[PDB]
Amino acid sequence: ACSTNISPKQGLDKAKYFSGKWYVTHFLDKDPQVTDQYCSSFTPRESDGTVKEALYHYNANKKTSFYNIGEGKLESSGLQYTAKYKTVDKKKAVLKEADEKNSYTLTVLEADDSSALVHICLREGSKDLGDLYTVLTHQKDAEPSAKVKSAVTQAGLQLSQFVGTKDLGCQYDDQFTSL
């Protein structure tokens, strides 16, 4: 199951996270449910205590993609939120409304002007799907900062064990993440 002991980084300025867009450069899926490798980019925003974020996934094996919009409330305790998610097309038109039994919780472990580290617990039945850690950069295929690489170690992980995305033949939809 996903860890219940993940807490966001204390003192982090949320503006460093809710800004620009993010590309996943490295991911650690602690308990994968499928064997395909994904690329992902997303654009998180917040307003008045509610996060809305536009999400994109690209299956590098199968060459398929899908789009979502997550929505949830910013924890008063720190940079963390539990979101419900709709399925959308590449123009953000809704294909399916959220299934309220499913959620994900995102916890920000580090963020600076170039890079971030987050933990995501996706619950896509009624079941934690297991921990996913993603290293993020504002620019595609860029190098994460030293600070973010330190945060990986401090989360008890080893960067050597992450899957990098730079060599996967990723295709992104930058128009979508710029909406």
Segment interacting with ligand HEM (CB under 6 A) among 8-16, 38-46, 144-152, 168-176: 38-46
Query: With contact defined as beta carbons under 8 Å apart, do 102 and 78 qualify?
Result: no
Site for ligand [N] in 91-130 (CB under 6 A): 120, 122
Is residue 28 part of the contact set for ligand [N] (CB under 6 A)?
no
Is residue 136 part of the contact set for ligand [N] (CB under 6 A)?
no
Check whether 57 is labelled as a binding-site residue. yes
> Cα(73)–Cα(162) distance, rounded to whole angstroms?
29
For 48: left if phi > 0, alpha if psi spans -120 to 50, otherwise beta; the answer is left
From 29, 46, 112, 131, residue interacting with ligand HEM (rule: CB under 6 A): 29
From 120, 135, 151, 152, residue interacting with ligand HEM (rule: CB under 6 A): 120
Distances (CA, A) of 39 to 10, 16, 36, 42, 127: 28, 22, 10, 11, 23
- Residue 33: other Cβ atoms inside 10 A: 11
By a kind-dependent CB cut-off of 5 to 8 A, residue 134 interacts, out of ligand HEM, ligand [N], none, with ligand HEM
